[PDB]
Amino acid sequence: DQICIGYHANNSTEQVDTIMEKNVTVTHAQDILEKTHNGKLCNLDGVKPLILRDCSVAGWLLGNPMCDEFLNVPEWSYIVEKINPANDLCYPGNFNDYEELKHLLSRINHFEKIQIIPKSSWSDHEASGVSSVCPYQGRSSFFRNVVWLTKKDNAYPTIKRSYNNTNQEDLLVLWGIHHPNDAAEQTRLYQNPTTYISVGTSTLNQRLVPKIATRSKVNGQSGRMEFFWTILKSNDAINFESNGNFIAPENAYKIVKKGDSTIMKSELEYGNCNTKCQTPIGAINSSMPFHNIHPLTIGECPKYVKSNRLVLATGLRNSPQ
Amino acid sequence: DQICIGYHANNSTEQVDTIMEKNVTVTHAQDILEKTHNGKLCNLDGVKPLILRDCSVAGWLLGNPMCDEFLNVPEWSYIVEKINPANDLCYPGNFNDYEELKHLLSRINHFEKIQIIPKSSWSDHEASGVSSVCPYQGRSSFFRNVVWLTKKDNAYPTIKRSYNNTNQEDLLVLWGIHHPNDAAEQTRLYQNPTTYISVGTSTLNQRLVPKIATRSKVNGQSGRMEFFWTILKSNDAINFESNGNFIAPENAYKIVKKGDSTIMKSELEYGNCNTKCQTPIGAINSSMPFHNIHPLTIGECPKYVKSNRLVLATGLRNSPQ
Amino acid sequence: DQICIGYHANNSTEQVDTIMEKNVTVTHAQDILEKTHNGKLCNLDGVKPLILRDCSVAGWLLGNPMCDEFLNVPEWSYIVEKINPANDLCYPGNFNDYEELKHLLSRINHFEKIQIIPKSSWSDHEASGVSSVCPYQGRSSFFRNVVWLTKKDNAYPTIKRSYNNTNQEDLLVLWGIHHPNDAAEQTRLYQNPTTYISVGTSTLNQRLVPKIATRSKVNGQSGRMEFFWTILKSNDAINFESNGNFIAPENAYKIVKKGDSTIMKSELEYGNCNTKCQTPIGAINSSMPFHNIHPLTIGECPKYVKSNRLVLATGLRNSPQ
Amino acid sequence: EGGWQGMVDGWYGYHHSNEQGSGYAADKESTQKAIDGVTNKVNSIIDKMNTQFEAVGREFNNLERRIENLNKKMEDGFLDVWTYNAELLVLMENERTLDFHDSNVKNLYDKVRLQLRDNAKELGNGCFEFYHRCDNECMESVRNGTYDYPQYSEEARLKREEISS
Amino acid sequence: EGGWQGMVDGWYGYHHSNEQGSGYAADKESTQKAIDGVTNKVNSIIDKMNTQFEAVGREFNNLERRIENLNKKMEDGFLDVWTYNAELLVLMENERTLDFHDSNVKNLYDKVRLQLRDNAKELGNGCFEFYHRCDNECMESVRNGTYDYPQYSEEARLKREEISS
Amino acid sequence: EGGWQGMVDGWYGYHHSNEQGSGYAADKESTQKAIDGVTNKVNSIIDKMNTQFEAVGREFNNLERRIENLNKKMEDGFLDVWTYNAELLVLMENERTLDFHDSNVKNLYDKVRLQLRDNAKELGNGCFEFYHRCDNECMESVRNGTYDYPQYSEEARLKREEISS
Ligand SMILES: *[C@@H]1O[C@H](CO)[C@@H](O[C@@H]2O[C@H](CO)[C@@H](O[C@H]3O[C@H](CO[C@H]4O[C@H](CO)[C@@H](O)[C@H](O)[C@@H]4O)[C@@H](O)[C@H](O[C@H]4O[C@H](CO)[C@@H](O)[C@H](O)[C@@H]4O)[C@@H]3O)[C@H](O)[C@H]2NC(C)=O)[C@H](O)[C@H]1NC(C)=O
Ligand SMILES: *[C@@H]1O[C@H](CO)[C@@H](O[C@@H]2O[C@H](CO)[C@@H](O[C@H]3O[C@H](CO[C@H]4O[C@H](CO)[C@@H](O)[C@H](O)[C@@H]4O)[C@@H](O)[C@H](O[C@H]4O[C@H](CO)[C@@H](O)[C@H](O)[C@@H]4O)[C@@H]3O)[C@H](O)[C@H]2NC(C)=O)[C@H](O)[C@H]1NC(C)=O
Ligand SMILES: *[C@@H]1O[C@H](CO)[C@@H](O[C@@H]2O[C@H](CO)[C@@H](O[C@H]3O[C@H](CO[C@H]4O[C@H](CO)[C@@H](O)[C@H](O)[C@@H]4O)[C@@H](O)[C@H](O[C@H]4O[C@H](CO)[C@@H](O)[C@H](O)[C@@H]4O)[C@@H]3O)[C@H](O)[C@H]2NC(C)=O)[C@H](O)[C@H]1NC(C)=O
Ligand SMILES: *[C@@H]1O[C@H](CO)[C@@H](O[C@@H]2O[C@H](CO)[C@@H](O)[C@H](O)[C@H]2NC(C)=O)[C@H](O)[C@H]1NC(C)=O
Ligand SMILES: *[C@@H]1O[C@H](CO)[C@@H](O[C@@H]2O[C@H](CO)[C@@H](O)[C@H](O)[C@H]2NC(C)=O)[C@H](O)[C@H]1NC(C)=O
Ligand SMILES: *[C@@H]1O[C@H](CO)[C@@H](O[C@@H]2O[C@H](CO)[C@@H](O)[C@H](O)[C@H]2NC(C)=O)[C@H](O)[C@H]1NC(C)=O
Ligand SMILES: *[C@H]1O[C@H](CO)[C@@H](O)[C@H](O)[C@H]1NC(C)=O
Ligand SMILES: *[C@H]1O[C@H](CO)[C@@H](O)[C@H](O)[C@H]1NC(C)=O
Ligand SMILES: *[C@H]1O[C@H](CO)[C@@H](O)[C@H](O)[C@H]1NC(C)=O
């Protein structure tokens, strides 16, 4: 007669590693590494992303004629662009402190476009300014949130304009300057050969003089446009003075900003999903402490790790008799 | 007859956690987390902080009329401001590279105010310049380390001034420019309508032209002042040339800089204490390897941790018989 | 008769520490800390460093008359300068965005000097400009990659020059401006008292006006030179327009840039060695997971650690009988 | 020598073989304490991770490559810290868990060994060969700590005398 | 079954019960080695922390929020690394310490078990019930490893014969 | 009591002393498993380190000291994380390795203890003093698990009877 002492076995082929032993077959195990994603862009903690398909932030803000115009969400938790987007600046240029702008717009609690200076209020300047790299439906056109001012009759009187932010929300205001190719273009467009833009706030004290020089044609254009912005505080006023080259605000944006995220680059499509953690390759179900999906995550995420496998032995050695 | 083998017990209710078991009552234990602070701002490794009560670094450096003037310490290990300070720039403006200035002044081995250009040396310009946002005791006044120059008789001759740093210590020099609201103010104050400031060192090559524009009234003021600084090396000279809008140095600062700290924001008061680690909520006795007091620490600190409790079992299970 | 159970001993004096016990003598042990280096600067993953002996990156790029000229390597993995180098800017000045330039040049896949504007193509300006802080062999001389233009006869006609980058490689272009000491020097050198440099690319839109002011003599010089650069893309053109003070490109550099490293400061000499990890005190054989050589490492390095010793017990306690 | 397929109702236990037959019985006490110990281990490893909101993105331009590089050293820094610590943490806890089971088995063995004494012999395979006859009730009595050794002491002794002669 | 209030002079030890009375005696050797082992553990955990001067402050302006965010990822990064590693380090070392005590107790038990052999029986509670009479001197002799087993072997055998009949 | 110089051919083993002489014999089975276990430990500690290309350099100017300071907090941050974790990782694994050897020795001891039973007495020093005579073949038989206990049981009993009288 015999009585033996021993332990459980089963059909499990789950293997685990120890400090001292590799590939120990074990009865039960638990991977602590998250490896699966859902292949979709999702709301993040309940808030939809701002998805710009083939649009830059710059072209979206300026009201680019290509880009879709039902791209008005009251609020967003992160922004998604394509890896390489196609609708940036129709007229060659740049945006000043562009990266800080993108970062500030990456998460917005409230956003609302308002008209700040009607296009029709320019009585003694032409507002009809337009170019053949900014078509809208076939006619040479322009950005819709911003107006290219040019001389009327044969004159460009000094512009002196102010806007008092009466809203209790802070205002994102955009304007630019046009850098012509030569003095002939300068006076053709603005009459006055020598020209300035001055912009004033409780905080901002700006003076821009256009740079008139020979330049590389970019999309056939040798001129440049440079855009600028600020946040006009609740009861503050912005003051514009210019005698040429001024690309004026038409619309501005009420903005409430309580925190940040970033700009994601993803080819993916919006699913109708909710996640605590979004990746550019899909969303992730953020229960495990570690993941190996992608480093560029947004949300409350597990820690990114360079591993295939993190498997914790739970049951016993499976060496059956 | 019996002999038993066993272990010690006592009245201890100290609980510890293990990987496998929660809330094991134990005979003796040792918390490795520091959780207590002394509620005071202290010397840091023996050196007093520079405590600016309701003063900015900018207003303290410029010699702000509000701020206390016995705020002269030979040396300091960190700076403390209030969370929101009340005596910043009396006249609306800004300081150029302000954050780098604050950071550089955050820890100073030696600091000493010296007069570099007496107020009384301005023979053909008025030095008496003053404003009603910079009162001192009732009379409109100004910053004491810096002089507002204005026209005398009805003229502003070009200023051409140099200062050779004869000390063996490096010199922190401050100056500014005044951006008027319009050409009428410009010539009223300086006569010359068109105006520059030039500033030269072995390193610095600066040219400032004032920006004359319409602006938001801030404390009733539409003009702005902008301040600038450098470190004038031991045998180097600084050269000033201006025909208007120049806010001149009167006093500068001998500075010895051997390392950095930062600016702390704290409501607290100076105790008469010494610590290796200061927090904005109190000082900490830096023996344990981990703490949960506050993240913004200065000194040789334990590692900040998001925990209530880090308790190491030392004695035995306390399950009495 | 007896039979005993026991374990191996030997003459080993290797000591190890445990959590609970210090200085346990042990039969065999393995240090996991790398502590030795070879005292030489080495190729890094097979690619030689660019070793500038007593030359700055700036003076090397500008073609400094002191610096050696067989300092042409097709490719390099990191750059080494001395801790304090002696051949920087012969004429006092500075380089714009210098640190970004150094960083960009820290690792280059292909580099090749090409002549972009021959010295002999300046028909109506003098190219012979030279100074007594830039000797080469005894005659006052200058940088070889860059030309100091001055008036010819008694005139300085507007320069209008373009260069189309026909190569398929991107081009690093350098130019500068001369900031004279006064109007007399200005017209002596350039005739035209009032002067500009304009520089244009598909990306760059630059306007430089020289700053004419009184300044500290540095190496006997009160004037300054300021250098600038860009990367001219493959089929892009750069356009230069100036009526004075222009320090023109002669040679530029074809550049292929696939990744970064940094600038090492080392007194050491190049050995004929290959490493995966270089330190400024010598190269390291990167097998162990931890090292204590130096923090400023380049390559695939072990983790820097503040330790003398990381010794893993392998054998048994050595307490002989 | 190994594990047991047939012990389907617990982690640790007993196999008996007598004249009435043979089969497996689990010790549900030590099993359930193991199943709670290992569940705490996993839950501690998971629940001690503190995670907050982060947005990791590349938002530096081409004149900010030094800061982009700083951000890169940082990200790689954390990747390495996490990769190594998680990999080693798994390895270390696995050795601990597998030793924990071995410890539980050995304790169940000792409970039996002290009960039997010289009434059985140890085979060196985790089994005991009885000298006397151990019926189904006798086996149950060894499992639940109730084995009473005097009842078989006399019968068992003569049987080792029989072996020694 | 548990610990002992009455053993006030040491960590591990013995309780005896005979005709002359009962009481606790500590093993001061294994106790002091435990008290040094655990003091090294705590001291290692504390003293291996290298700390240098740092000034953590928020000194980026509102056109430097990308760098402020970099500094934030960093700070949170370190907070998480430290929080998790310190939490897990406590958990792991606690299991180790509590097992260390169990190991020390078990060793003290074995020293007795080899000494007594068949002169006593194991009760399965960490006690041994002697077959013979063990006076105060006999008890001391078991504690200090001096127990001499022949003196009681004959007396103890008849007494198991008495039990088996 | 300690280790053994004379056991030059293995890590764990046996020393025997009889009338024919004395000497050391290693258990090559448990030794080789130890020598593989400890080699895996070291290799895991080394091979789990993931290292990528980095260029750590100081490339911020004197109007970028806030960013230089950020880069400094970072570097010191990682230095501390690595220093503490590597120091503690060595300490923890060393205690584990030294306990692993103790565990292997104790198991080799138990294999002998179950074989001998009352035919030898435990001395409490890791040795067994036989009651009967154990020749060179008898010793080999104890090492390789072949010891047959009936052959000596009778001879050994009378010899404890001789001691008890
Ligand atoms: C955008 O428009 C806003 C108006 O819709 C501007 O804000 C207003 O500006 C006025 C004038 O600059 C300032 O207020 C005046 O009244 C205050 C009292 O304000 C307090 O009481 C108000 C009235 O009941 C409340 O509404 C306020 O919340 C607060 O409780 C007086 O103290 C001032 O007096 C001083 O200045 C005058 C003018 O010269 C002197 O003559 C006096 O002697 C005295 O010294 C102001 O007159 C205030 O800024 C604000 N008022 C309101 C109601 O909002 C805003 O400035 C504008 N932004 C810009 C940049 O222009
Ligand atoms: C702030 O003021 C300081 C003076 O108090 C200025 O420093 C002095 O400037 C002078 C003139 O620029 C320079 O020195 C001249 O003498 C040196 C020799 O210096 C060495 O010997 C000195 C004299 O004993 C010591 O004091 C020094 O430490 C050092 O050992 C000569 O070599 C120079 O000669 C050259 O230049 C002259 C002038 O044209 C030529 O004619 C000669 O042919 C020759 O080639 C200098 O004359 C030096 O800079 C310094 N001297 C002292 C004593 O400090 C400082 O420059 C000023 N700062 C600014 C920015 O203006
Ligand atoms: C540096 O020099 C380069 C030339 O060596 C410049 O690039 C060339 O510029 C020309 C003129 O600006 C542009 O190309 C013209 O031809 C394209 C077709 O290009 C496509 O076919 C080419 C010809 O076979 C291929 O070589 C190309 O790879 C590509 O496949 C036409 O579509 C354009 O037509 C439009 O513009 C003309 C001019 O006014 C209008 O009249 C027409 O009606 C039409 O709308 C161009 O004419 C092109 O940029 C490029 N060509 C080549 C061969 O490289 C480069 O621009 C220069 N850099 C700068 C900054 O100046
Ligand atoms: C057992 O150990 C081996 C080492 O020989 C591990 O080998 C790796 O296995 C992975 C997983 O599929 C392969 O992708 C790798 O190529 C292997 N590495 C090498 C160097 O060969 C193996 O993974 C271990 N197996 C398990 C299941 O844990
Ligand atoms: C024993 O475990 C429990 C889990 O049930 C721990 O619960 C936390 O206790 C803290 C400390 O006071 C409370 O603040 C938390 O609210 C509890 N968490 C939850 C989810 O209930 C408990 O702390 C443990 N006790 C000790 C003393 O270590
Ligand atoms: C044994 O422990 C002692 C502590 O008393 C360690 O002491 C250090 O030894 C180093 C190494 O040579 C010396 O540089 C230090 O000065 C010692 N520190 C102190 C505070 O005295 C000792 O290193 C340990 N020895 C070994 C070999 O591991
Ligand atoms: C064990 O695993 C296999 C594979 O899925 C499964 O089909 C089989 O039924 C399992 N056996 C038991 C007893 O659950
Ligand atoms: C145990 O703890 C209590 C609570 O403070 C204390 O008053 C009591 O005296 C302690 N007992 C002993 C024996 O120290
Ligand atoms: C042990 O170490 C010493 C010191 O080098 C060496 O000379 C000696 O020969 C070694 N002994 C053996 C047996 O290897």
Residue numbers in the entry:
A (entry chain A), B (entry chain A), C (entry chain A): 1 to 321
D (entry chain B), E (entry chain B), F (entry chain B): 11 to 175
What did the paper state?
Influenza A viruses infect both avian and mammalian species through binding of HA to sialic acid (Neu5Ac) moieties on the surface of host cells, and viral host specificity is determined by both viral HA structure and the type of host receptor. Herein, we report the antigenic properties, receptor-binding specificities, and crystal structures of hemagglutinins of three different H5N1 clades responsible for recent fatal human infections in geographically distinct areas: A/Egypt/N03072/2010 (Egypt10, clade 2.2.1), A/Hubei/1/2010 (Hubei10, clade 2.3.2.1) and A/Anhui/1/2005 (Anhui05, clade 2.3.4). The overall structures of the three H5 HAs are similar to that of Viet04, comprising a trimer of HA0 protomers, each with a globular head containing the receptor-binding site (RBS), a vestigial esterase domain, and a membrane-proximal domain with its distinctive, central helical stalk and HA1/HA2 cleavage site. Highly conserved residues (Tyr91, Trp149, His179, and Tyr191) formed the base of the sialic acid binding pocket, surrounded by three highly-conserved structural elements: a 190-helix, a 220-loop, and a 130-loop.
